[model samples]
Target: SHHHHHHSMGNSSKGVYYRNEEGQTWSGVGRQPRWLKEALLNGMKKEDFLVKDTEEE
Candidate 1:
């Protein structure tokens, strides 16, 4: 038999939240997917993701 890892995100009526495979729940913050970090380090260009502006409106 084999096993696989899985992840999921969800939000409560109170606010946005998510739980990882480890059963860790979080809220009020943005999460960066693993592939996104890999892409950044590979020089895939942050501009494409519109991350150049570190400001919030």
Candidate 2:
């Protein structure tokens, strides 16, 4: 006999945020999404996706 333990943990959002020039957003978690991949291939750097602080006065 054999047994295995597994639990389903839904997609927990990562606190970190990322965005692109077109205003696309990513949680910076799990596998990178398709749009991000395309952007990378099209000469976009990972640094380009970093979310900058923009607090309003």
Candidate 3:
């Protein structure tokens, strides 16, 4: 018997950017960063971090 395996490459630039009140930014990729974790604990909503496309874009 033999086993074959494969993996896919992940794009670092794929997800949107999120920022906290202190101005720390997160790429919104894998596990949530510390600043975000603290905010959530204090009752800040996740959607609040979503970066929207402005007219400038």
Candidate 4:
């Protein structure tokens, strides 16, 4: 999939935390989702869903 994000045109220091197939998300500052629990239970790593950095190279 081609994913692009814009931190331009004014923005918050906030960034993407967790993202799912349906584009469901949660702020990493608070509690995350059971989507993670489901993934981990199914043998996927939490890192798989983490949205580390978008603009960073």
TM-score of each: 0.30, 0.52, 0.56, 0.52
Candidate 2 Cα misplacement greater than 4 A, ranges? 1-15, 52-57
Q: Highest TM-score, which number?
A: 3
Least lDDT summed over 10 consecutive residues: which range in candidate 3?
4-13
Model 2 CA lDDT for position 18: 59
Candidate 2: clashing pairs of residues? none
Q: Which prediction has the highest lDDT against the true structure? A: 4
The lDDT of model 1 is 0.38
Q: Give the Cα lDDT of each candidate.
A: 0.38, 0.56, 0.58, 0.59
Q: Give the TM-score of candidate 4.
A: 0.52
- Record all residue pairs in model 3 with backbone atoms less than 3 Å apart, i.e. clashing: none
Q: After the best TM-score superposition of candidate 1, give how far the Cα of residue 9 lies from its true spot, in angstroms.
A: 28
User: What C-alpha RMSD separates each model from the true structure?
Assistant: 13.3, 12.4, 11.4, 7.9
Q: Which one wins by TM-score: 3 or 4?
A: 3
Write model 1 residue lDDT over 1-57, tens digit each, in one string: 535322212223443433333333444257755554555587754333331112211
Model 3, 1-57: lDDT tens per residue? Answer: 535321112323444566678777776667878888898887977556555332111
